[PDB]
Symmetry: C3
């Protein structure tokens, strides 16, 4: 019996904003249940410190730089997306007999060939862009007004949600709507004589900061307005996870389902998040930007009550899911992660003596990160490379590059070696960003990989 | 019975240079016959305001920017062309049982894999470059002299014409030569138990301005030397269309043949053309550069004596021809036009609430055009975006952008959205053009899509 | 019986550094034997004036610019290589029943899909980078020390050699080691009922200048330290050729084996080489950079004791080997050389009225070369195009461009035409080189093909 698989991804969820990863103010009982009876991950890294490229990496199992997807898609819409020649984990599972669903945020291409239904998902219910307004009673009138005015380029956050290409009129708070459709999906899966894969991509707690009064009422001792709204938004996700878990139990799916819960990137401190004890947040190559909460839950397979301390990459989920599903991986797919399960089961480092990378572009330069065993190499703000023993110095306070010159230089040269098959970006999130890229002769890797 | 299809394209034909589209001085009786007994199009647009990219769009059904073909091919020759992975309308029809011919101007690649015979044409008779000298007695001696001198890079306008890869020695005025081969092609098609597709690409009335004395004699009241030569050149095309039509009738092909006649782009005013009432001409994103004459003729299918007033794109011919031929279109072909026939038959707009675009690059900036319902948005000469109600203001005289700020902004943002899958050009028409493109960080779409 | 084929390539071997090509000080008796009983080539050209692109051209039969391989691979390692869609001569021969081996220097990609065993070589014994230190007793302790320190990016010149993906511990001087494995390969080939192809890629006489005392002792009258070391290194290659030849004779393979011996590029004057009488050396588009020593040896087929005076390209070896092996070449492979054997046998020019090109990129500009019949067109150091009658002026002393303006202009325009399907480089040898390429809007072919 092949297991069902559920990948739950929250959007801009801060490192300290779920109870199992150290939250003292936001309360996440249903998510914490999964942690307490499963394994959480203290050194879990996404492939990029923001949404689009991170999500591309999750789906393809490749660093987004390898497939021209290093930037978020154009904010006002486009006819491009994550390239079709990189087989999504969903398509691979669908080809090995899985019933497949995707819910909520896509952020990987609007067009027919980039649509969830052509990337291997039998079901899709959600919004295709970078986010969405949370209240239908707020957004539907705005959209109606603009459509009646003849406007064709409407802010994607107020546009109707869809189900398999057909527009719907959603009635509920979006987090709750997506949770309801998660229940509907796993309910539909009972009647199929097949295992299922569900990709549940919540837009919470991403902007705009919009919560239900009923969820905000549960945090009366949180005085800061943004933090209370944010706390409410996260609580809605927790309620949703509970509702999904309950449906899995009723359907007798729970015991044979691997649930993964994570964030797509680090939390944004100016929009209510907390990343303690990590430095900085969303978009950074500091730990706060791409080190995220993660838990696995699968009874009698994932040990209960444990805390896994070795590095794990979002890139690992593609080959790890494939191995558990009995799906063959071809070498021409160029997967950048590893099947982490053998090493996971022995409590060993699945990236022993192997680097994990982050490379985020800016105007005329790039910030970078290398995580390798106990070492974190850091390139930020055009300053020289820094080195931290991240196991003793999680907050990146003590640069020890002066005492380890050869090691750091070696780590950077390996990243330079790794960079040669990075593709030129196929798009940018804004027109001026792409113009500046060309004006500045990017990538300026002569600056990025300069050593000592 | 699947219909035969003939696409006749003239080269630099001005908007007012055929009788059915308002010519008062050039006379085009045989072309006008097709219009009078068919439907002409008052709002017909090509995909680019000059040859190579326009022709690539006709053949592929894709905006040339999508396939790296936004510029004319190198003037002195090259080993590149319209990419082989974009299936030509000719190949699609050939795969669905059509006998296929192409005549005259190619301008889409010289090399073996870019040659007409590898792009789905059973027959090809013509010249592969951007144009040709019209008189064999003039050009053949020039070529002979240069070949005997050992020169290998010879101006493509004097090089021998070819038939399916073998050089020929043409004897007649080129317009007449191509017309004769159109007759030969449809004559050969009688013996095949198949429908046929013919792509007749005349180089007239493109430069050099060379006409027969016999055709120029028919316009004694045209005093301007260039305009008289030009008029003659166009008259030769009209004679040719007549000869082709006559052959179709004799062969019992005429009633089951859809004939399309059009220009590849707007006329060039400094080389004898007239684009009245449109502003500017060849190469412009003003209407004069990419709005062209067009007619459909197909008895008992295309209504006789009509004038279709809704926008139509050259891009529409690919899926429209395919639907009529019963040829399936796969979604991975990424076609940018639409099958216009359903909407055409109901006299409705086949691009209702959908834009038609032109984007022509220049040195360090781009000019652009958007046609959407009654609206023409215009970006020219690095000035701010202008808006015209093109149905009331065909000559683009009255900028009404100040009264419609939100609408214009919306139209431009949609074009910006559309631009993201434009590919970097695979070539340029001159080396310095490509160098300047790279020096200037092109495309400078930050300037093109501002406000 | 299809013939066996051996391609022996030395690395940075100067033009005057083998006896048969005019050496007065370095003595190469075994290599000279092959010349004296075969044919040498006075006008043999590689496709690029340095290693990686030259080697890519040898293997693919294509100019390296056509396949994005105009630069050496990154010096400190990479996950890229000569593209997999360009079938190597080794794979073609392997598919037509040949037992295939490659020895020594690769310099065409480290990764699994770029590895010799996936590019059609049954056997590989060597080092995958741009070169190697010659003494195991010197390099193995350095590598051991650095590996134990935890370093993962180790200079490729001290890393272990490998045999079919498994690391080895080599005991001998590398030139001798590779010669020993050439003997082993042709010995293994006796037991196979198949012809064999062997690609023997010596790193000698490339840096570092490291020779055995026993080889240096043979040149007591060479006073210059570098020249003596270099002479020794070359003598080691000669000993190796002798050892291979002896094995071929013992195995009765010699008479049915075409042996080719050549250099990958011109010699480097600052590292012991001599290119007399050619101007300049390694990396240049002067003759000294890409005109190399070459000989063919094949008893009763290649005439004995001859000197072939017509141009021949490294690109020719792909289709020439294929024709002799009875292996079919598909037109979709886009081969840039020619099967030179028919013309070779008649003592005619296999590139009669056809150019041979060199195009080497630099910081913000490109140097170029055109060889066509008796003519050498030269573009160097950003100076204007020069023309030489290279048959009368091998040392490029007398620029005769003023007396042949039309001819030169024609040659350059043809090269400009040829350049349009050059691909943007897929990598560079250093990060700064790639940055400078983008900063300078390269290629600056406006400068390269001016006038
Ligand atoms: O009703 S309103 O909200 O008022 O108006 C809206 C709309 O605004 C909203 O749009 C979305 C939804 O909520 C907010 C709000 O502003 C906004 O949130 C954005 O959502 C995105 C997804 O839709 C995305 O989130 S993600 O998907 O999880 O990734 C956005 O995050 C990203 O934003 C950029 C793209 O990647 C990152 C960001 O990169 C920035 O790019 C800038 C250039 O454009 C700049 O780069 S640089 O110039 O090349 O250097 C910037 O760096 C700079 O930042 C400041 C300024 O200068 C310095 C520094 O001091 C420089 O470093 C760079 O960060 C990614 O964010 S990340 O945190 O960096 O990882 C997310 O913000 C309006 O947009 C619209 O006009 O109107 C509607 C109403 O109609
Ligand atoms: O024997 S001779 O005729 O005396 O000499 C010939 C030959 O000349 C001829 O070559 C052809 C045949 O007749 C004429 C003649 O000059 C010429 O006509 C050209 O035919 C082409 C096809 O072969 C093509 O027509 S098309 O196939 O229908 O498209 C040509 O039109 C195009 O020309 C350019 C390429 O696309 C468009 C043009 O783009 C121009 O490019 C310029 C850069 O090189 C420049 O761009 S910019 O530098 O980025 O700004 C230019 O813009 C500028 O132009 C002037 C100068 O400054 C302003 C403006 O005032 C600036 O805007 C840009 O337009 C397309 O033209 S379009 O009208 O824009 O659509 C067609 O001209 C000689 O060439 C040869 O050397 O010798 C032989 C005899 O041996
Ligand atoms: O122990 S040490 O030896 O001291 O140190 C070593 C190691 O150094 C060695 O590494 C190898 C082995 O011996 C030497 C030594 O320095 C070096 O040799 C090089 O081997 C390569 C293969 O491994 C390759 O040979 S080849 O495979 O046969 O091709 C090298 O030749 C090439 O080198 C460059 C790449 O292609 C050619 C060269 O191109 C150069 O590119 C430069 C940078 O971009 C520059 O280009 S430009 O700026 O754009 O114009 C350069 O031109 C310039 O050079 C100077 C400066 O400005 C002018 C000029 O005055 C400008 O023209 C251009 O040549 C090809 O050479 S070619 O001759 O041009 O064809 C071969 O040299 C160290 O590297 C390591 O770190 O340490 C170890 C010890 O630990
Ligand atoms: O760059 S160069 O130094 O190499 O050349 C320079 C200059 O830089 C170029 O910009 C310039 O280019 C013009 C245009 O293309 C080629 C050249 O002439 C073209 O027009 C000619 C036209 O003059 C000619 O007319 C002659 C004339 O009347 C009829 C005809 O024959 C008679 O004998 C008489 O002399 O006809 C040509 C076609 O046969 C051609 O006209 S056309 O084909 O373009 O319609 C172009 O001029 S244009 O862009 O103004 O139209 O050349 C100079 C070198 O002089
Ligand atoms: O969705 S939010 O970004 O959290 O907040 C917005 C709005 O702030 C925005 O207003 C414009 C558009 O982008 C920025 C600004 O230039 C953004 O502010 S910023 O992130 O601080 O730079 C906020 O003013 C309003 O109250 O709420 C909306 C969301 O509903
Ligand atoms: N159980 C293990 N695999 N431990 C080693 C993992 C790497 C470890 N962080 C180190 O100090 O090198
Ligand atoms: N004028 C001449 N063609 N001289 C002889 C040149 C010889 C040259 N190798 C050729 O093949 O042509
Ligand atoms: Ca996010
Ligand atoms: Ca034209
Ligand atoms: Ca070399």
């Amino acid at each position: 019996q092949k297991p069902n698989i559920i990948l739950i991804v929250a959007d801009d969820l801060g490192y300290a904003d779920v109870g199992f990863n150290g939250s003292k103010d936001i309360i996440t009982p249903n998510i914490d249940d999964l942690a307490k009876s499963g394994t959480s991950f203290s050194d879990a890294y996404v492939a990029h410190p923001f949404s689009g490229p991170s999500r591309a990496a999750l789906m393809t199992g490749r660093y987004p730089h390898k497939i021209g997807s290093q930037f978020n898609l154009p904010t006002r819409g486009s006819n491009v997306g994550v390239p079709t020649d990189a087989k999504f984990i969903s398509k691979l599972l669908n080809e090995n007999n899985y019933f497949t669903g995707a819910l909520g945020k896509w952020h990987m291409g609007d067009t027919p060939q980039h649509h969830p239904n052509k990337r291997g998902f039998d079901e899709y219910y959600g919004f295709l862009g970078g986010g969405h307004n949370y209240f239908p009673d707020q957004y539907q009138p705005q959209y109606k007004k603009q459509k009646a005015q003849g406007l064709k380029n409407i802010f994607e956050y107020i546009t109707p949600l869809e189900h398999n290409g057909k527009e719907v009129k959603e009635t509920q708070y979006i987090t709750d709507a997506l949770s309801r459709e998660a229940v509907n999906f796993v309910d539909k899966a009972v009647n199929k004589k097949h295992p299922f894969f569900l990709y549940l991509a919540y837009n919470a707690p991403h902007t705009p900061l919009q919560a239900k009064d009923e969820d905000m009422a549960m945090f009366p001792n949180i005085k800061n307005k943004d933090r209370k709204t944010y706390a409410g938004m996260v609580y809605a996700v927790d309620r949703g996870v509970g509702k999904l878990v309950e449906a899995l139990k009723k359907n007798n799916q729970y015991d044979n389902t691997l649930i993964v819960f994570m964030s797509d990137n680090g939390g944004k401190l100016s929009k209510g998040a907390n990343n303690f004890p990590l430095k900085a947040g969303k978009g950074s190559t500091q730990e706060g930007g791409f080190r995220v909460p993660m838990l696995f839950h699968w009874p009698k397979h994932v040990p209960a009550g444990k805390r896994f301390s070795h590095p794990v990459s979002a890139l690992d989920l593609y080959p790890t899911f494939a191995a558990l599903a009995g799906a063959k991986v071809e070498e021409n797919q160029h997967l950048d992660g590893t099947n982490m399960w053998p090493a996971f089961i022995k409590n060993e480092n699945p990236h022993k003596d192997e680097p994990i990378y982050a490379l985020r572009h800016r105007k005329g330069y790039s910030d970078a990160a290398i995580r390798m065993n106990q070492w974190k190499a850091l390139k930020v703000n055009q300053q020289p490379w820094q080195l931290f023993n991240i196991e003793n110095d999680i907050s990146e306070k003590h640069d020890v590059s002066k005492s380890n010159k050869a090691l750091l230089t070696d780590m950077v040269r390996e990243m330079e070696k790794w960079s040669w098959d990075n593709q030129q970006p196929s798009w940018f999130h804004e027109t001026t960003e792409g113009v500046n890229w060309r004006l500045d002769a990017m990538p300026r890797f002569d600056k990025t990989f300069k050593t000592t």
